[PDB]
Amino acid sequence: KIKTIESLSDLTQLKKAYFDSSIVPLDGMWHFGFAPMAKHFGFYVNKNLVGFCCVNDDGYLLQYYLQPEFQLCSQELFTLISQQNSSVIGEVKGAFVSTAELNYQALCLDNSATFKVNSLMYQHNTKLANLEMIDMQIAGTEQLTAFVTFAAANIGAPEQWLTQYYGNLIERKELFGYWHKGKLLAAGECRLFDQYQTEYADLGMIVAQSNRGQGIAKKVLTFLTKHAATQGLTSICSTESNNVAAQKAIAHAGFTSAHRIVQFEFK
Amino acid sequence: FKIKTIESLSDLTQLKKAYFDSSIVPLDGMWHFGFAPMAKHFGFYVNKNLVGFCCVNDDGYLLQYYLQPEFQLCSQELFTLISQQNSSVIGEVKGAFVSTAELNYQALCLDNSATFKVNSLMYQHNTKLANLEMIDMQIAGTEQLTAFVTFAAANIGAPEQWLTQYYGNLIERKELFGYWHKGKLLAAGECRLFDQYQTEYADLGMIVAQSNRGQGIAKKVLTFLTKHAATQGLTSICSTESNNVAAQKAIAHAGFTSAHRIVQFEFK
Numbered sequence: 001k002i003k004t005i006e007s008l009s010d011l012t013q014l015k016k017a018y019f020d021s022s023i024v025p026l027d028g029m030w031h032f033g034f035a036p037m038a039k040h041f042g043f044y045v046n047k048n049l050v051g052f053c054c055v056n057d058d059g060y061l062l063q064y065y066l067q068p069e070f071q072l073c074s075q076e077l078f079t080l081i082s083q084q085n086s087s088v089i090g091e092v093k094g095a096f097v098s099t100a101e102l103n104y105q106a107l108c109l110d111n112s113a114t115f116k117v118n119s120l121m122y123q124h125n126t127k128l129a130n131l132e133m134i135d136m137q138i139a140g141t142e143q144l145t146a147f148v149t150f151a152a153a154n155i156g157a158p159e160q161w162l163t164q165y166y167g168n169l170i171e172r173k174e175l176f177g178y179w180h181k182g183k184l185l186a187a188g189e190c191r192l193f194d195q196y197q198t199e200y201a202d203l204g205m206i207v208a209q210s211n212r213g214q215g216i217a218k219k220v221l222t223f224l225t226k227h228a229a230t231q232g233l234t235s236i237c238s239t240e241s242n243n244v245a246a247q248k249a250i251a252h253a254g255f256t257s258a259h260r261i262v263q264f265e266f267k
Numbered sequence: 268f269k270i271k272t273i274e275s276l277s278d279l280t281q282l283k284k285a286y287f288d289s290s291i292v293p294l295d296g297m298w299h300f301g302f303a304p305m306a307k308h309f310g311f312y313v314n315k316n317l318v319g320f321c322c323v324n325d326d327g328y329l330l331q332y333y334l335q336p337e338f339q340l341c342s343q344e345l346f347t348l349i350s351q352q353n354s355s356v357i358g359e360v361k362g363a364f365v366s367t368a369e370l371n372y373q374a375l376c377l378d379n380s381a382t383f384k385v386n387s388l389m390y391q392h393n394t395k396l397a398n399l400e401m402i403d404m405q406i407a408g409t410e411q412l413t414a415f416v417t418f419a420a421a422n423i424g425a426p427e428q429w430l431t432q433y434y435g436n437l438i439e440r441k442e443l444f445g446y447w448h449k450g451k452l453l454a455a456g457e458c459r460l461f462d463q464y465q466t467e468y469a470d471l472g473m474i475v476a477q478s479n480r481g482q483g484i485a486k487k488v489l490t491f492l493t494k495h496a497a498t499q500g501l502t503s504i505c506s507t508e509s510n511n512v513a514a515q516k517a518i519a520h521a522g523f524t525s526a527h528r529i530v531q532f533e534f535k
């Protein structure tokens with residue numbers, strides 16, 4: 001039986017177990033930004049909560065997890081949900097899952113019609129990295145407006161949102177700037193996980209549109225990678241499948257990618 | 268006086284600190300630490316030394332103005348030039364927001380404005396309130412962010428993406444609280460610290476579920492939030508809009524008084 005989950009505090013043990021089973025650390029924006037906003041549902045076997053999933057506003061699953069002993073029942077359940085058969089979850093179009101979420105992926109594969117790759121998940125290898133070095137500085141409170149103006153002009157995110165997002169990163173000391181003669185040439189993020197994945201750092205960059213192709217992005221990832229290493233964290237990052245320039249920089253910053261976020265549609 | 272645009276707010280560290288030191292009471296957190304740092308900033312230069320500044324928001328309204336204290340006469344000349352739209356660099360300014368606690372900036376607005384209206388009331392807490400039943404609020408944890416976001420989105424219409432960041436950050440700062448019943452939020456309370464200038468105060472906010480108005484809840488929330496501030500050694504302040512009669516009533520019942528106002532002035 002399936003119920004809407006009132007309080008996400010009921011899922012504590014099962015979430016930890018879900019993340020533990022991942023082959024690699026999962027993408028922070030997907031699983032710590034979007035997933036928590038999504039509607040959750042608990043799977044209850046005889047009044048004990050033994051699983052959950054969550055479905056976004058567009059009608060896409062983002063997570064699914066049943067306690068490891070319910071194989072044949074797991075298959076039937078997933079097929080039910082994926083085939084619109086739950087009065088209580090309703091119309092589910094599809095799923096987003098990575099190649100690091102084996103069980104969830106497996107069931108997606110069995111019950112989906114088509115797919116596309118959403119993004120690449122990378123991890124850092126020390127051996128894969130004499131590149132020229134830059135210095136970046138920790139963003140201070142007073143620099144907030146300059147970072148917001150920068151990000152807005154270069155990725156088009158909304159200012160009000162960026163003000164809060166970067167406000168928070170500045171408090172966490174996770175935002176960095178590459179400055180040249182008074183202007184920002186890049187913003188870098190070295191983001192820590194508050195839970196489950198506390199031994200990793202998730203990296204992001206924006207390079208000024210006026211200075212693409214100068215190899216800035218790769219120097220930024222190198223810097224952020226070292227800043228992560230000095231805190232004892234291993235670096236990961238991700239990017240969209242059609243973002244060729246990001247993929248280039250990342251690979252030249254010594255990252256490799258054996259993982260993908262895929263978007264499946266149900267039959 | 269040369270007016271110059273200012274990119275790095277670092278250039279204004281000292282001038283800003285004097286601006287705030289000069290205030291009669293602590294100023295509103297959302298106005299002065301949320302909005303003002305997002306606004307466009309200009310500096311006032313005597314002979315290539317930076318001796319004052321102002322900031323103009325997106326709508327064309329001044330939010331802050333300050334000249335080193337010894338420029339009384341030039342200050343008036345300056346403000347008038349800027350208010351009658353003759354500043355090449357600053358451009359067309361429509362008006363100003365200013366409180367009754369910023370005496371110098373207010374004076375100049377008074378001198379140069381055509382019309383006005385009140386925007387909000389600023390209150391502070393006199394330890395002459397209330398043996399009265401006190402509610403228990405629970406500090407928000409990460410797990411409850413979405414419930415808070417949904418609660419605020421439904422009750423005040425702010426956007427969810429924005430709320431997710433604003434509330435995520437409050438949760439990390441331990442400034443957000445919830446008043447719960449049967450798994451649902453009856454109200455949300457904020458007890459916010461200031462990182463600089465006003466570190467002896469806590470700035471409070473609340474949202475009462477629209478399904479539970481007129482049941483005394485906001486008063487009780489404010490009372491909790493004041494006590495939580497007091498355990499941190501902080502004095503409580505808050506503000507609300509001039510049309511928010513329910514808020515004003517709860518605030519004044521929670522033992523707060525108001526000698527101050529934020530006013531919106533329109534320029535002649």
Ligand SMILES: [Cl-]
Pocket residue numbers: 136137138
């Ligand atoms: Cl630094």
Ligand SMILES: [Cl-]
Pocket residue numbers: 401402403
């Ligand atoms: Cl109570």
Ligand SMILES: [Cl-]
Pocket residue numbers: 447448449450
């Ligand atoms: Cl209760």
